[PDB]
Design a protein around this ligand. Structure first.
Ligand SMILES: [Mg+2]
Ligand SMILES: [Zn+2]
Ligand SMILES: [Zn+2]
Lengths: 1336, 278, 79, 49, 49
DNA sequence: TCCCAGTAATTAACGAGAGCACCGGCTATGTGTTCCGCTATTC
DNA sequence: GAATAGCGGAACACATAGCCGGTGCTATACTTAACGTTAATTACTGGGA
């Protein structure tokens, strides 16, 4: 039907071509009759008749007389829905400027004319004349004149010069403007200029003019002459009940514009004096400029209720516009909602639907069936059958519901498990029964949470909900490979209670001939559910290619663990239920069943687990009484001791030995010690409190206390809510975040007093307000993340690259945070990962790493796996299925089509409501200082002459478990490559003394080290050594600024000690604030200290990492590898001369002199190493160290926010957001291609344009990749609708409309808006068919 | 450099003409009424401050201030058009009538979204003035009955004219205070049938056509042209008398016969008068 | 008589060619130009289509062959 | 009359009595709200108030 | 908030150096406001409404 | 002569639940005709 | 069955009157209007190297 949406400027003759008549009167309707009035804003000759096939006179009234324009009324009889699609046009008496091309801040009339906006609005408001082609007889073209200046210029020049005023002047400017010659002049001036601000200005002006030439528009269509009106049924005048009416607010603004246009017409026709017609044009132009937008140009005009009226631009912008209220999400028929309940008898693809909702939703199906059975031959009878709800309309409903999935959905829909499908089961009720295993996915509680239902009508949708959205299909989360249907809180406590043993129950020691005699014993009450019993089990391994092999045995186990074993299917080993089987141990059974057996005997397994866990927590009778909180007996003693210590420290502080800040952390110390000692002294009282006796004395064991079995088993509890029921509940905070000294020392069993309850209420009103504001932030975060990742769709099967990032386990200073195996589980390789016997490839180059290739790496202990990643995929407009990886909520590779962008946006969006001196080796390995120069000190050990100094603890197998980073200048107690023990302080340094240590030895001299100008006399007054210390350059005189104290070394034989290896001299020009203790002419050694120099949020950290904001103290880096120096030092700027060994020297950089520098002004720095310290922007990381460094920086710096809160997220979901941030890449040199120099074209298009040019004989383009934040990389998009259905719309429509932009409908929001199939899943093959048949 | 709003620029502008004396006004009108346009320009250009002074009083009605000023300007142009200096009067007394009346007609015209005429608005203002004077006599709101008492006019007339003072509401204002629900969410499209009534009509049409073809031809042609149903026009019994069957009484007879057959055919499907008409 | 479509996905890959093939087959059976191959168990046409996929006697190749053969047979009715 | 009825009829603080208890009536009358005229709104109420 | 003088500080960054800038504010029950804010260069700046 | 820092504007901040003359032109309004329909009489 | 006559009466149209509805006119003189964020970003503009 249509391929593309084109937007452009609308001429004053296009507007006369849409329109069906000129709205000449302000009046809307008649008042006695409610007839539309000829010819105002609701007419009928203009916009069409009010009743279907009926004139206004009514003399023609039929479909038989269709189409004929009447004679008494001029009203063309048609349907009456033509009033939604017929516009009228107002003829403005003077032109008025359009407010979008004037006030949207990069103002198009402004930067098109190169006239500043203040001078334009001083013309439009008739204040100042502006020349229009007066020539350079005396004046400039776009020079404004004030009134008296105009008057004397008119006295000197009556002729040969013309200066108009107002919108006629601006229109004479625009239609007098030439485009090609002015574009040539600006192109030559851009060629000649060198200032980059003016270069960017001319680039913007050139690009605007070039888009104006390439689009078919002219510049003067920015000035409205013929104003089009909306059709009437888009701004209705619906009668309310009682002779009352209600208008959309557009009728008022249109009435205002028509009124001022009529009055201006009559003011010209009366030949008014010019002050009144200038006031009248000022008054229109504004009535218009309000209609088009209210609040922009000054203050908005308001209605009777002291509220501004809703203009045209208000019906598009924001949450109340069409774009995100009526067009993206719509209200939907065949729907309904209710409260939800449990109903735990369901199988997990079923749901409870009431007989009243299901009779209502399935209405037209019951009509279509009651016509089929002959029970009602029409629809007027089939309606009244289901109206009175006969006995036979309830048998029809059980047919039309039988295999028709419904679509349950909770209200804060976060991820794709928030909408699932269920074959419904009819309930006599009013609530929605819903399986217990799926409330973990929905995050649904039965505290009154409501869920909406939906009906897939069409035959494709009943299959879509069964193959993709059914509950038995979604058992793994899309965010990571963890299962999602885990047993939640009651079933797991029941399964904990069953799988236990006590030391002496009934029937202990009897032998059992199967897991069924275990049921017969327990149901007859002859043995307890916890009795250590020799049963014989029969477990099946599938060791061969699917061969279930029996092997009976004789396992020492319980009567509970043997009863439970009959629920476990065939292939699982028996040692998965031969434990206490808490919450964690269940989800690692319902995952091994999914891996070993498959999908179907895991979906049948989770129902049996739930049915058994409920039934055996029923018979458990597991209550909670007030005696189940055993308050420890040593709590009183501990609290008495810690109350003696605080009074002692309080006496000492009054004795002046300690200050308030020293007793503060000494009282908080003793209370945080006693708060631990209480909680540790009660845990030996909770869990071991069962001390029972088998045939003898006593045996302690794990307790059958009820509050221990609800926290040990993981079923709704922890060790931190306990210690607030029996132990003391510790220290509390205050609204400053400061911790209160005197803690609250009563458990919830003993009750709180008034003051302890008041103290521990800021902690609750701080936590509740946190979740109040947290959801408001986390909604907006995933709103941005979805729209930055729309059009990413798995489009190929292999892009064919060998690039891709390199993976390493996360060794963050101490232990391994996340190992290599869990980072590269399910991601194909880019190189052949081979064993450290490096003549043999262990894995092939493009294998998909599932577990069976993970374990071959885990045995051969590989540390670095090069992997294929999304951000290195060479697919234009999409991501190849290899480069993405595994399906992650399906075990196989990703299916071609499946839109990873949205599912990787939601997996970062939905956890967002859960957010806010010496180095010691602590293991056994070998010391590895990596890639760092380091000299032998005067003590013979190793002192550090490197900035990026990295300590590794290489194990006996060549891997690292402990990595470290060493600062500059640290003495090494050990050596490299040799095994050391644990607890070894291997390196040591002062965190304050910065050594400026040498590398050569011999007699040092104080060359260029003089007093009075460079150094001062502040000797060691405490010991008696002549310390020759240096002042700073801010305090010393200007004769010794660049003259720095160097350390040149000679010998006593007249020769000079220089740098060995090279021919360069060995001197070290010390900067200011240098404290030298040595002397001149005395011998120095290698590695001797020359001069002793002195020195987040959870959610907003993610929201600023994805936004890529500039941190306030950027780490200034080394922009080019080479030697470093200091140029001419300005007042606050030290022009850091970075001289390469071969390249261009004069890159100097003004460094704020007050910032603490790091490099010692003479070091050959590698490119992209630090000059100062601080958090770095990802813009600098990208420009210096490339794409693969920023894609590691972001996925490290955001996994260190998610793992801190214990949220696991696979890293591909962050790699695709990184990939969608750098889609734009500005050009450096255009080359032979058709680009400009400083323009920012998108990298996908330049990846094709020079691709065919290098495929041709020509040269390519040199382009630097560019990073944008997700509020900008989503707003700099090719498709102007997926950027306008977002934040600012008046910017994007205006910028696109002056550019003649043309959406191609390739993303997903655009195809959602326009109403066709998205190009993602089921609708992918149809779009492939369309794009194949088109261009063919 | 003036701050560029329309009111400040205008009110600063209008002072650039010295106010005219009486002999000055008379001489300018003598030059003006014989067709010298400069005199008209001077007379209208000077007395703009009179228009701002007069239209100052008409503020805070439905029109904004500059609308009132510009509509007074039209009457001022009318006033210099029809001023007479031969009465010897000062110009302000004669122009005050024209400016005051052409702002009064402006507020009567361009205020209400549904335009009431002049005489209806004057009649409503008579009643509102009566209610304002009646409220101090009984210290409550005077009823429609009370105004009809005090003016001795019929109660239905005063009720109608007060109901024509409805103060037509907006749609876009939210309801209930919370800004989530305006009248667009409350109002239902009443003329457009939904799919249920729209499929009942089509099923009823096809059922009618099926039952008519179930009836014999001579009856159904009479019943087709009789109501314009089966692709025909709704004809008279006299018309189909001259067109098909010459005895008009027999056309009535075959019509009653076809109606009885269709009554039987409808009731065989269980559709009785209670079924189709509740 | 259907809970998991997993074996159908084992036959027809990609999880989406399944839905398009089963939609085309259930359009054949609903708009009653056809009849089911495997017997119905009073299942809706959707589930008979999925059980036909699961036996492997319906896929896109079988459907295209049968539609081309049907058009050949319809062209053989000109006479 | 328009001013005082506009306050008592529909202000921010002129609310319906949530009349489905005795308790609900009392704790509606003894309410200390910080919204309304001369008071802040929910959108710009920082973590301090 | 009670009308009268109100010597709030700033206590945020708001400077890119972390200096605090104290500002008085004179709220009446009815009338125009009045501040006296400090500037980062230790300039004292009035502002009215 | 170009960089640069303070200043002002713009964008965003979850989901679903007076008063009279005067005229003219429309329209209600008698009213005729008329036309249709219905009934009733008679061959 | 079929012609003819009476007759209600519905209504439709036509011609009129009448009355809504728009317009013009008024003559001491009169002369310049109506009280918070929060953060980020970007365009602008006065000021410095
Ligand atoms: Mg809940
Ligand atoms: Zn008509
Ligand atoms: Zn690829």
């Amino acid at each position: 039907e249509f391929d593309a949406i084109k937007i452009a400027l609308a001429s004053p003759d296009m507007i006369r071509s849409w329109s069906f008549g000129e709205v000449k009167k302000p009046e809307t309707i008649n008042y006695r009759t409610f007839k539309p009035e000829r010819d105002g804003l609701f007419c009928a000759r203009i916009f069409g008749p009010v009743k279907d096939y009926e004139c206004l006179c009514g003399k023609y009234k039929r479909l038989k007389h269709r189409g004929v324009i009447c004679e008494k009324c001029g009203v063309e009889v048609t349907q009456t829905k033509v009033r939604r699609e017929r516009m009228g046009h107002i003829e403005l008496a003077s032109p008025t400027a359009h407010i979008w091309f004037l006030k949207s801040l990069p103002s198009r009339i402004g930067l098109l004319l190169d006239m500043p906006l203040r001078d334009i609005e001083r013309v439009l408001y008739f204040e100042s004349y502006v020349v229009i082609e007066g020539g350079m007889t005396n004046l400039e073209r776009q020079q404004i004149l004030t009134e008296e200046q105009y008057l004397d210029a008119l006295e000197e020049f009556g002729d040969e010069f013309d200066a108009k005023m107002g919108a006629e002047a601006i229109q004479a400017l625009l239609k007098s403007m030439d485009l090609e010659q002015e574009c040539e002049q600006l192109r030559e001036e851009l060629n000649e200029t060198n200032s980059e601000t003016k270069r960017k200005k001319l680039t913007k002006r050139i690009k605007l003019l070039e888009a104006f030439v390439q689009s078919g528009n002219k510049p003067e269509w920015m000035i409205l002459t013929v104003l089009p009106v909306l059709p009437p049924d888009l701004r209705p005048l619906v009668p309310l009940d009682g002779g009352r009416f209600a208008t959309s607010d557009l009728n008022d603004l249109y009435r205002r514009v028509i009124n001022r246009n009529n009055r201006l017409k009559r003011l010209l026709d009366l030949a008014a004096p010019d002050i009144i017609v200038r006031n009248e044009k000022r008054m229109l132009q504004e009535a218009v400029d309000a209609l088009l937008d209210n609040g922009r140009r000054g203050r908005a005009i308001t209605g009777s209720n002291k509220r501004p009226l809703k203009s045209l631009a208000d019906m598009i912008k924001g949450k109340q516009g069409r774009f995100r209220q009526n067009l993206l999400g719509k209200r939907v028929d065949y729907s309904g909602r209710s409260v939800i309940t449990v109903g735990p008898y369901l199988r997990l693809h079923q749901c409870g639907l009431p007989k009243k909702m299901a009779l209502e939703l399935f209405k037209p199906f019951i009509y279509g069936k009651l016509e089929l059975r002959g029970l009602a031959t029409t629809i007027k009878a089939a309606k009244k059958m289901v109206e009175r709800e006969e006995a036979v309309v309830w048998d029809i409903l059980d047919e039309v519901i039988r295999e028709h999935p419904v679509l349950l959905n909770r209200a804060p829909t976060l991820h794709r498990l928030g909408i699932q499908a269920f074959e419904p089961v009819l309930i006599e009720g009013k609530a929605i029964q819903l399986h217990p295993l799926v409330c973990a996915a929905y995050n649904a509680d039965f505290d009154g949470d409501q869920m909406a239902v939906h009906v897939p009508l069409t035959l494709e949708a009943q299959l879509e909900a069964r193959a993709l959205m059914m509950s038995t299909n979604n058992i793994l989360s899309p965010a990571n490979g963890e299962p999602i249907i885990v047993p939640s809180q009651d079933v797991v406590l029941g399964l904990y209670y069953m799988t236990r043993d006590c030391v002496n129950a009934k029937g202990e020691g009897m032998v059992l001939t199967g897991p069924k005699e275990a049921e017969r014993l327990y149901r007859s009450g002859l043995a307890s559910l916890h009795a250590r019993v020799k049963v014989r089990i029969t477990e099946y391994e599938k060791d061969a290619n699917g061969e279930l092999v029996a092997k009976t045995s004789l396992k020492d186990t319980t009567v509970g663990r043997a009863i439970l074993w009959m629920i476990v299917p065939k292939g699982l080993p028996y040692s998965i239920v031969n434990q206490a089987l808490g919450k964690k141990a269940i989800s690692k059974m319902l995952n091994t069943c999914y891996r070993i057996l498959g999908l179907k005997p895991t979906v049948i397994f989770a129902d049996q687990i739930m049915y058994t866990g409920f039934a055996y927590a029923a018979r458990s009778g597991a209550s909670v009484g007030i005696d189940d909180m055993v308050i420890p007996e040593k709590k009183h003693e501990i609290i008495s001791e810690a109350e003696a210590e605080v009074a002692e420290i309080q006496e000492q502080f009054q004795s002046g030995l300690v200050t308030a800040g020293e007793r503060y952390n000494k009282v908080i110390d003793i209370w945080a010690a006693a708060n631990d000692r209480v909680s540790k002294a009660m845990m030996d009282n909770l869990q071991t409190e069962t001390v029972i006796n088998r045939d003898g004395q006593e045996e302690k064991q794990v307790s059958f206390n009820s509050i221990y079995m609800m926290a040990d088993s993981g079923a709704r509890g922890s060790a931190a809510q306990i210690r607030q029921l029996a132990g003391m509940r510790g220290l509390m905070a205050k609204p400053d975040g400061s911790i209160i000294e005197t803690p609250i020392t009563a458990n919830f069993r003993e009750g709180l007093n008034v003051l302890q309850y008041f103290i521990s209420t800021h902690g609750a009103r701080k936590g509740l307000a946190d979740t109040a504001l947290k959801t408001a932030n986390s909604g907006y975060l995933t709103r941005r993340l979805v729209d930055v990742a729309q059009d990413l769709v798995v489009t190929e099967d292999d892009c064919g690259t060998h690039e891709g990032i390199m993976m390493t386990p996360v060794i963050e200073g101490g232990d391994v945070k996340e190992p290599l195996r869990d980072r590269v589980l399910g991601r194909v390789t880019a190189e052949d990962v081979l064993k450290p016997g490096t003549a043999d490839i262990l894995v092939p180059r493009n294998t998909l790493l599932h577990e069976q290739w993970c374990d071959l790496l885990e045995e051969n202990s590989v540390d670095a796996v090069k992997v294929r990643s999304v951000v290195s995929c060479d697919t234009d407009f999409g991501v190849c299925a290899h480069c993405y990886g595994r399906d992650l909520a399906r075990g196989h590779i990703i299916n071609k089509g499946e839109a990873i962008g949205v599912i990787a946006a939601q997996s970062i969006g939905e956890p967002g409501t859960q957010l806010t001196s010496s180095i010691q080796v602590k293991n056994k390995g070998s010391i590895k200082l990596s890639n760092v120069k380091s000299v032998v000190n005067s003590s013979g050990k190793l002192v550090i002459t490197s900035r990026n100094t990295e300590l590794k603890l290489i194990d006996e197998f060549g891997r690292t478990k402990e990595s470290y980073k060493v600062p500059y200048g640290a003495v090494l107690a050990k050596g490299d490559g040799e095994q050391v023990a644990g607890g070894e302080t291997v390196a040591n340094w002062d965190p304050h003394t910065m050594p400026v240590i040498t590398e050569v030895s011999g007699f040092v001299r104080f060359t260029d080290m003089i007093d009075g100008q460079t150094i001062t006399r502040q000797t060691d007054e405490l010991t008696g050594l002549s310390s020759l210390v240096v002042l700073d350059s801010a305090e010393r005189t200007a004769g010794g600024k660049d003259l720095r104290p160097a350390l040149k070394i000679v010998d006593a034989q007249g020769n000079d000690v220089l740098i060995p290896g090279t021919d360069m001299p060995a001197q070290y020009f010390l900067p200011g604030k240098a404290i030298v203790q040595l002397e001149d002419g005395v011998q120095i050694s290698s590695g001797d200290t020359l001069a002793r120099i002195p020195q987040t949020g959870g959610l907003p950290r993610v929201a600023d990492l994805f936004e890529a904001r500039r941190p306030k103290e950027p780490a200034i880096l080394a922009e080019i590898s080479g030697i470093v120096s200091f140029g001419k030092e300005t007042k606050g700027k030290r022009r850091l001369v970075i001289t390469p060994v071969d390249g261009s020297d004069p890159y100097e950089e003004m460094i704020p002199k007050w910032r603490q520098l790091n490099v010692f002004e003479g070091e050959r720095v590698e490119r992209g190493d630090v000059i100062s310290d601080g958090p770095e922007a990802p813009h600098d990381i990208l420009r210096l160290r490339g794409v693969h460094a920023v894609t590691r920086y972001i996925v490290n710096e955001v996994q260190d926010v998610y793992r801190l809160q214990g949220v696991k997220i696979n890293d591909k979901h962050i790699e695709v957001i990184v990939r969608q941030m750098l889609r734009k890449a500005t050009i450096v040199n255009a080359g032979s291609s058709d680009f400009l120099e400083g323009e920012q074209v998108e990298y996908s298009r330049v990846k094709i344009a020079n691709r065919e040019l290098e495929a041709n004989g020509k040269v390519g383009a040199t382009y630097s990749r560019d990073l944008l934040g997700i509020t900008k990389a989503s707003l700099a998009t090719e498709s102007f609708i997926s950027a306008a259905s977002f934040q600012e719309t008046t910017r994007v429509l205006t910028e696109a409309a002056v550019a003649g932009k043309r959406d191609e409908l390739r993303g997903l929001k655009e195809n959602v808006i326009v109403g066709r199939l998205i190009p993602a899943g089921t609708g992918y093959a149809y779009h492939q068919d369309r794009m194949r048949r088109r261009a063919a | 450099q003036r701050v560029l709003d329309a009111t400040q620029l205008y009110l600063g502008e209008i002072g650039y003409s010295p106010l005219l004396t009486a002999e000055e006004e008379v001489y300018f009108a003598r030059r003006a009424l014989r067709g010298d346009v400069a005199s008209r320009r001077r007379m209208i250009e000077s007395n703009l401050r009179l228009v701002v002074k007069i239209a100052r009083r008409y503020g805070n009605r439905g029109l904004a201030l500059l609308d009132l000023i510009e509509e007074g300007n039209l009457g001022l142009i009318r006033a210099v058009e029809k001023f007479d200096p031969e009465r010897g009067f000062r110009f302000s007394t004669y122009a005050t009538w024209w400016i005051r009346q052409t702002i009064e007609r402006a507020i009567m015209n361009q205020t209400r979204t549904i335009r009431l005429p002049i005489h209806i608005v004057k009649e409503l203002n008579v009643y509102l003035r009566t209610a304002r004077e009646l409220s101090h006599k009984l210290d409550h709101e005077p009823s429609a009955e009370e105004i009809a008492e005090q003016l001795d006019k019929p109660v239905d007339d005063v009720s109608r004219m007060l109901r024509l003072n409805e103060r037509i509401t907006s749609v876009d204002t939210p309801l209930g205070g919370d800004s989530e629900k305006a009248l667009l969410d409350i109002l239902a499209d009443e003329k457009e049938n939904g799919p249920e009534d729209t499929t009942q009509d089509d099923d009823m049409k096809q059922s009618i056509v099926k039952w008519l073809f179930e009836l014999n031809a001579k009856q159904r042609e009479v019943l087709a042209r009789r109501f314009g149903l089966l692709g025909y026009e709704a004809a008279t019994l006299e018309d189909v008398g001259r067109e098909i069957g010459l005895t008009r009484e027999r056309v009535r007879q075959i019509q009653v016969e076809g109606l009885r057959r269709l009554r039987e055919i409808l009731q065989t499907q269980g559709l009785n008068i209670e079924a189709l008409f509740r | 008589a259907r809970v998991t479509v997993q074996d159908a996905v084992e036959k027809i890959g990609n999880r989406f060619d399944l839905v398009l093939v089963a939609a085309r087959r259930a359009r054949q059976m609903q708009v009653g130009g056809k009849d089911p191959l495997v017997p119905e168990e009073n299942d809706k046409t959707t589930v008979i289509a999925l059980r036909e996929i699961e036996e492997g006697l319906i896929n896109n190749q079988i459907l295209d062959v049968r539609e081309r053969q049907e058009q050949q047979e319809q062209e053989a009715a000109e006479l | 009359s328009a001013a005082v009825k506009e306050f008592f009829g529909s202000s921010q603080l002129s609310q319906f009595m949530d009349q489905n208890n005795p308790l609900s009536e009392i704790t509606h009358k003894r309410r200390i709200s910080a919204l309304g005229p001369g008071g802040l709104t929910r959108e710009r109420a920082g973590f301090e108030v | 908030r009670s009308p009268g003088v109100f010597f709030d500080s700033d206590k945020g960054k708001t400077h890119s150096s972390g200096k605090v800038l104290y500002n008085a504010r004179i709220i009446p029950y009815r009338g125009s406001w009045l501040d006296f804010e400090f500037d980062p260069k230790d300039n004292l700046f009035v502002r009215i409404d």
